[PDB]
Every structure is written in C-alpha cells, then in structure tokens.
C-alpha cells in the first residue's frame, strides 16, 4: 500500500476555489472569525502566543456582549476554556 | 491557441468526433464557401451544402466543372454533381465524388428556412 501525492497541485487549487466560493457566498463578513490570544500549555511553548478556538463566558461578559448574540455577530465561544 | 478546458486538442478525440459525428453534425462539417458575387450579395462567407445547389468545382481533376448537386452523400462526406461522372469498364456512368469544401456555391436554393439562416448568420437578404 502506497500513498502518492500527484494530486497536490489539484488539492491546492480546489482549496483555493473553496475559499473563493466561501468568500463570494458570505462576502459582507470576513472569511475568518475572530480568534482569542492563547498561550500554549507546556514548558517548551509557554513563551509564545497563538490563536485559540474561541473566547470564554467570563471574557464575553466582561466585554459586555452576551454569549447568545456573540455567535450571531461572529464571535466564537469556548465553554471549556477558563481564565486563571 | 485554445485557452478553454471544455474543448479538446487531442488528435485521437478530434478524429473520433469527426468520423463518428451524426448526420446533423456532418451537415455543418460539409460546408462550402460562396463565390465573390454571392459573398458580396449576402455578406456571408460560408454556407452549409444542400441538394439542388448550383456549384462549381475549384480543386481536383474536375477543376472548372460546373453543375447542380444531385445528393449530399453525407456518410462519406461527399457530394454528387450532375454530369460529373466517370466511364466504368463497361461504359456506365459512375458519379465522381467531390468533397464539400473543394467546391464553391455559385447559386443558392432559396426557401424560407435558408433565408432565415442568412439573416441569422449576420447577413442581409
């Protein structure tokens, strides 16, 4: 059993068209949602900052936007993450 | 050079399509040009070949012969012209076939359908 990569340019082109189709469909709004700033959970990468899945309820409430309307305006919500 | 992807450039596919085209497609393939007076009269460069059209041979051993068409023998991409025949061994007349693109149409067979074709193909009556 071998897995060959002769469709790598084809996959790349298809993904770009899918992004293009997504942009055309939902053009009024950005094609990528807002993501929170989050620090990796290990001693090797705790010095960096990357994009987390979504914001928390405490952050949402402190900002003043409710968790119900946050999804509607495009703010992803993570119910698992907590601010320590 | 072609820039689309809906059309082909393979010799294999072009010949297969050409020799396997149905009668409706062979009608378009079996087109002939018009004479200078006809071209300046209808503003049409080329027209499909139809029976009972008055044509003149431009190339081949019958270069200069003129006559009407007795049949457009489509399944061999061939025309048959009055008096443009061959003497067989016994002496009978066997019609000599001429390709549709090697002749010139010097007089048309006008009906309502063909006039519609002329006005539709950017022409004037």
């Amino acid at each position: 059993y071998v897995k060959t990569w002769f469709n790598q340019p084809g996959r790349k082109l298809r993904r770009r068209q899918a992004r293009q189709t997504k942009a055309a469909k939902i053009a009024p709004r950005p094609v990528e949602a807002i993501r929170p700033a989050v620090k990796p959970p290990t001693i090797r990468y705790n010095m960096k900052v990357r994009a987390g899945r979504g914001f928390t309820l405490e952050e949402l409430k402190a900002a003043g936007v409710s968790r119900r309307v946050a999804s509607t305006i495009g703010i992803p919500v993570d119910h698992r993450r907590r601010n320590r | 050079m072609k820039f689309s992807r809906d059309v082909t450039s393979s010799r294999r596919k072009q010949r297969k399509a050409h020799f396997g085209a149905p009668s409706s497609v062979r009608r378009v393939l079996m087109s002939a040009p018009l004479s200078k007076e006809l071209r300046e009269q209808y503003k049409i460069r080329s027209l499909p070949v139809r029976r009972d059209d008055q044509i003149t041979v431009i190339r081949g051993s019958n270069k200069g012969r003129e006559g009407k068409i007795t049949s457009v023998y489509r399944k061999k991409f061939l025309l048959l012209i009055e008096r443009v025949t061959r003497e067989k061994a016994n002496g009978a007349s066997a019609p000599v076939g001429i390709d549709a693109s090697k002749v010139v149409i010097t007089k048309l067979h006008l009906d309502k359908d063909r006039k519609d074709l002329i006005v539709r193909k950017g022409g004037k009556v």
């Binding site: 009024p28 709004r29 305006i73 | -």
Partner: protein, 121 residues
C-alpha cells in the same frame, strides 16, 4: 401518414375505427409481401405500422390525461400516475418535514439569527 395533432382533435371511437381499418390494411400489405408485391407496398408496410403506433400513442395519451383529470386533487392516485424519479428520492424526507423545527429552535432563530456584519479595514 396521419398528423398527430389532427389525430388529437378526434374522438375515441373514430381513432378506434381508424385503428381497425389500419390493421386490415397492414394485414393486406403483409399478404402482398408474402405473395409478391411491389416496392411501394413493401415501403408502405413500414409507414402504416408507424401510423398505427401513432394512433396507439394518441389513444393512450387521451386515456392518461382523462385519468389524471379523474384523480385530480386526491390524496391517493394510481402508481402509474405517480412520479417515478428514483426509489431513494421517493423514500427520502420531503422539504417540509426537513424544515420542521422545534419551538425551541424557532425561538432561537427568531431572537438570535445569523446577523449581517462587516469590518472596517
């Protein structure tokens, strides 16, 4: 041959009689072929066969439109009059019952629907 449209503007019995005389003629034409006939008769065999086929076609159409009129606006109709796309499409969920939602989801989509927003660069 008979034109299909003027075949349509006639009644059932006339098409029935035309069918009957066509079958007489076809039987006569075939016995000419067996006993030796001219090329006109041999070619006429095909065109008369097609003309009976036309009369069978128009008769069947008139019957089916008549049946559709009879069963118009009814819950249950014969399986021939029913649609036949595929067995899977027939068994699938209809758009109405795919769009059915609980009142909980109706309230959610009433009060917090997908909003229309944008970002200033």
């Amino acid at each position: 041959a008979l034109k299909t449209f003027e075949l349509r503007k006639q009644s059932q019995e006339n098409l029935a009689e035309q069918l009957q005389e066509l079958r007489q003629e076809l039987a006569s034409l075939r016995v000419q072929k067996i006993a030796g006939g001219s090329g006109s008769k041999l070619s006429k065999i095909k065109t008369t066969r097609k003309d009976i086929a036309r009369i069978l076609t128009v008769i069947n159409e008139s019957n089916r439109l008549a049946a559709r009129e009879a069963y118009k606006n009814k819950k249950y109709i014969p399986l021939d009059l029913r649609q036949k796309k595929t067995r899977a499409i027939r068994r699938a969920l209809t758009p109405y019952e795919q769009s059915r939602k609980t009142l909980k989801q109706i309230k959610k989509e009433r009060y917090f629907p997908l909003r229309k927003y944008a970002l200033k660069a």
